[PDB]
Design a protein around this motif. Structure first.
Motif, PDB file in Angstrom:
ATOM      1  N   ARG A   1     -43.047  91.038  35.858  1.00 41.92           N
ATOM      2  CA  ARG A   1     -42.963  91.143  34.391  1.00 41.92           C
ATOM      3  C   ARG A   1     -42.611  89.511  33.858  1.00 41.92           C
ATOM      4  N   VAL A   2     -41.900  88.900  34.540  1.00 44.81           N
ATOM      5  CA  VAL A   2     -41.643  87.461  34.184  1.00 44.81           C
ATOM      6  C   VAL A   2     -40.683  86.714  35.241  1.00 44.81           C
ATOM      7  N   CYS A   3     -40.623  85.692  35.298  1.00 43.70           N
ATOM      8  CA  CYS A   3     -39.823  84.679  36.220  1.00 43.70           C
ATOM      9  C   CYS A   3     -39.672  83.146  35.655  1.00 43.70           C
TER      10      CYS A   3
ATOM     11  N   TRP B   1     -47.102  80.666  43.723  1.00 43.62           N
ATOM     12  CA  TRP B   1     -47.532  81.861  43.073  1.00 43.62           C
ATOM     13  C   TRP B   1     -46.760  82.906  43.360  1.00 43.62           C
ATOM     14  N   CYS B   2     -46.792  84.243  42.604  1.00 46.64           N
ATOM     15  CA  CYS B   2     -45.924  85.389  43.117  1.00 46.64           C
ATOM     16  C   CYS B   2     -46.968  86.469  43.347  1.00 46.64           C
ATOM     17  N   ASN B   3     -46.529  87.144  44.736  1.00 50.02           N
ATOM     18  CA  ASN B   3     -47.654  88.166  45.017  1.00 50.02           C
ATOM     19  C   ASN B   3     -47.397  89.184  43.978  1.00 50.02           C
TER      20      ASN B   3
ATOM     21  N   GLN C   1     -41.842  81.010  36.367  1.00 52.56           N
ATOM     22  CA  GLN C   1     -43.035  80.629  36.542  1.00 52.56           C
ATOM     23  C   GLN C   1     -44.051  81.447  35.549  1.00 52.56           C
ATOM     24  N   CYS C   2     -43.903  82.843  35.610  1.00 51.17           N
ATOM     25  CA  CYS C   2     -44.587  83.690  34.522  1.00 51.17           C
ATOM     26  C   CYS C   2     -44.061  83.224  33.024  1.00 51.17           C
ATOM     27  N   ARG C   3     -42.877  83.422  33.005  1.00 49.13           N
ATOM     28  CA  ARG C   3     -42.237  83.120  31.748  1.00 49.13           C
ATOM     29  C   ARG C   3     -42.681  81.894  30.927  1.00 49.13           C
TER      30      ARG C   3
HETATM   31 ZN    ZN Z   1     -43.300  85.809  38.660  1.00 49.69          ZN
END
Ligand code: ZN
Ligand code: ZN
Length: 81
Positions: A56-58, A32-34, A60-62
């Motif tokens: 904002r995105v990456c 996950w992302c902090n 994983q979120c993207r």
């Molecule tokens: Zn992310």
């Protein structure tokens, strides 16, 4: 020069965390992302960025669907989803 106190201002972004889970005779690592703005903690934890510009995105979120309605704001209540 080289040897000198290296400050560390605001440098938001995306930093992979690690939330080992003791289960059985094996362990499981959680991704996950902090992402960063939040002090990483040894264990699964989701911090709500206050900046409102990340995450904002990456990579994983993207992909994530909720990303469409991603709440970079720590206003939301919880995460029933
Ligand atoms: Zn992310
Ligand atoms: Zn942030």
């Amino acid at each position: 020069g080289p040897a000198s106190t290296s400050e560390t201002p605001i440098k938001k972004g995306h930093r992979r965390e690690i939330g080992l889970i003791w289960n059985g005779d094996r362990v499981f690592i959680d991704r996950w992302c902090n992402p960063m703005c939040s002090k990483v903690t040894l264990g699964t934890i989701r911090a709500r960025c206050t900046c409102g510009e990340c995450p904002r995105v990456c990579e994983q979120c993207r992909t994530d669907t909720g990303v469409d309605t991603r709440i970079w704001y720590h206003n939301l209540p919880e995460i029933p989803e």
